[PDB]
Symmetry: none
Subunit: 126 residues, 4 copies
């Protein structure tokens, strides 16, 4: 089983200077719970619904920039990689989400631990 | 065997906020308690629920940090008494196509939350 | 949801005087884990793989008759009944299996608690 | 984070019978311990497994009550060390398309049983 068959297809992202309220609006209209923060050319972080609640919960304003409340992270994975490969990286880098790119580097999707345990559920004798 | 009752399978010590609690204070509770939702109460009685998504949605709609709970929560008055048999909670969940139900006492006050998973565990238990 | 959509289709049964070793042979060839014991016209009990192991485990011989090691029970349910109806009977009569019959009384199948919890799993917003 | 290891998620205190144990004695253990299967060992080392179905099958094939464990068990030498990382057990399960694995110590002796559900729980835990 590969990342591609379990990741959530998603090419939308937001810049490191994007505003929290604007980010929230994108996620709401696109109907997504997580989003990759890119420093123009590459992913530099991830933002989930929990990160937005936590940011407000810590005293940050609705204008706070993405880079100030996202989970900073540079690691990515190829969509062709085995899911167990994604699991290993999430563990080693302590992250619940992985931006998924192609052989060229273009952002294709995002895969999370939920997807991993799911793929496991889908896969036996006693 | 006798019927198992909600009270013995519900998750107690749930977190709630009043219907006029402000968005920022609610986000603060969820952040400090590390939870993904809270029950909104009106004088101890459940009137809705606020999830992380409800918060993000309200912000994405331009609501300020002072927005009251009742203005952006998911409204719901569906509840089940703690003295109710397990299957009673099940019948209510099916009827309203929902996985969780606030649990109240005979006076209508919030006591806990029971989920569809709690129900199957109760079935497994008695068997 | 009704019993019929979750029960295991099965019209085979064994008599109350049937021998344990013969019962075991039927279940093995038909590849089933449970079986209804009938007193000719109606169900009078149930026999599962566990009952056969338990019978041997208690000192009974391979020749032991069905009625001597089965779970005695006369209750049945219609295949058209709602699953919650099956759950109620299993609870009230303390049994993990229910012989399923039709409007005429013919043995159609057997439904167990596993089927019930399964049907529940298959069925929502948060 | 470091890798979780089999030892911390395996079910210990499992029941085993020797490879020459008789069918009736094995059935007696399973009945008295109220379990659905036992590990068959050869000098503490796992050589197979006997489930309720294996017992019924042997009887249905005319085997007597004195039939030895090794004659009707499901033979299997696939095992995983208790010091192994969780994913190691996972890789072995996938490879052999099986949901459970006997766990042994460095000397090959039976210590427990780890299942695919234990693996997902370990994943949920560390996350």
């Amino acid at each position: 089983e590969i990342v591609k068959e379990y990741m959530k297809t998603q090419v939308i992202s937001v810049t490191k200077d994007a505003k929290l309220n604007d980010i929230a609006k994108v996620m709401t209209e696109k109907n997504i719970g997580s989003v990759i923060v890119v420093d123009g050319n590459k992913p530099v972080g991830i933002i989930t619904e929990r990160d937005i609640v936590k940011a407000i919960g810590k005293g940050k304003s609705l204008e706070t920039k993405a880079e100030e409340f996202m989970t900073a992270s540079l690691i990515t994975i190829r969509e062709d990689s085995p899911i167990t490969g994604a699991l290993a990286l999430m563990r080693q880098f302590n992250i619940r989400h992985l931006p998924v790119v192609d052989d060229k580097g273009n952002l294709k999707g995002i895969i999370s631990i939920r997807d991993i345990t799911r793929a496991i559920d889908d896969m036996m004798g006693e």
